[PDB]
Design a protein around this ligand. Structure first.
Ligand SMILES: Nc1nc(O)c2[nH]nnc2n1
Ligand SMILES: [Zn+2]
Ligand SMILES: [Zn+2]
Lengths: 189, 182
């Protein structure tokens, strides 16, 4: 659309944002996010996904995935779509606005510099990641020149940080995606 | 606004018009001038005092323009640079503005990008960034730039994006000051 910023969502992602879901444990939240990653890969997207949850209830607010290529938008990273769709559902730019419960971002990989800033501005009070930055860059993706000690930057910003949650599974998905990135047809892929 | 099958960021009349009107501005100040014009209309359209536009670096052909639409759009990622770069990619049918066969693109923005936009610029494919107001000018009216890397400018140049700042700074600050006063 030339009259607005329009990022369509693949069916699976639409399903994820339509069906009520509650996941109490961190492993439960991250496990669901990893399901979206495999499904995004199957839906022509990057091996990345994230979701916004109510930190104290585990209620899924919104889910997002990498749609850069099919979306014709380099700003379409998982964290950004998840944060935006969440803000659109709660009808506010601040997920920390008076009246709403604390929000948490559960992302399959540590945020690049762009999404890093996106998180700080989002209003979320917590960030939980799976794959470390080195894991993402090991298969080719660039995290960008994030400020030094970005983690300490978030905490000082009142944003608690956690990483490595279900890292092994997150890494397995990053590597299978990489094992198909090529152009030579692979029936196994 | 809010949707189920998509993230839809509506645009106000003037911005829609700006994204569909033929406009070729060769000189740098010409481009920055138009952009500051968008700032004003945006302020009147309930948006923040920020705007940007992507241009064909050498011909000055306007490709797309964006403005801060955070509050009215209920989206903290809706900064001038994000939308402009995003709508430019939409109009050129690609996520990479440096794609082969595509002309070099430039993002003329009213204020220096925040840590977030900093990254968007890097992943956008643009090869040039021209800014009017400086970071301290932005911070001087209550707008945060977030924790950017040490020497974000060198960070952009190291990646093939030449940076120019201070262009029409004074004219842009007058718009920042007025926005702040109201
Ligand atoms: N710092 C800052 N804050 C916003 O909300 C912006 N929108 N556009 N550019 C912007 N820059
Ligand atoms: Zn990112
Ligand atoms: Zn910004």
């Amino acid at each position: 659309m030339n009259d607005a910023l329009h990022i369509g969502l693949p069916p699976f992602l639409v399903q994820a944002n339509n069906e009520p879901r509650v996941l109490a444990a961190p492993e439960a939240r991250m496990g669901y996010v990893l399901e979206l990653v495999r499904a995004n890969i199957a839906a022509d997207g990057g091996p990345f996904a994230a979701a916004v949850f109510e930190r104290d209830s585990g209620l899924l607010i919104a889910a997002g995935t990498n749609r850069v290529v099919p979306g014709r938008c380099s700003a379409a990273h998982a964290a950004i779509l998840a944060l935006s769709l969440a803000q659109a559902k709660l009808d506010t730019h601040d997920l920390s606005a008076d009246g709403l419960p604390a929000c948490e971002l559960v992302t399959s990989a540590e945020p690049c510099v762009m999404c890093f800033g996106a998180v700080i501005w989002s209003g979320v009070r917590s960030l939980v990641c799976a794959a470390r930055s080195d894991d993402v860059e090991a298969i080719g993706f660039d995290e960008g020149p994030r400020p030094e000690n970005w983690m300490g930057g978030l905490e000082a910003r009142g944003i608690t940080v956690t990483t490595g949650l279900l890292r092994d599974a997150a890494c397995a998905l990053l590597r299978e995606y990489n094992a198909c990135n090529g152009v030579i047809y692979n029936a196994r892929c």
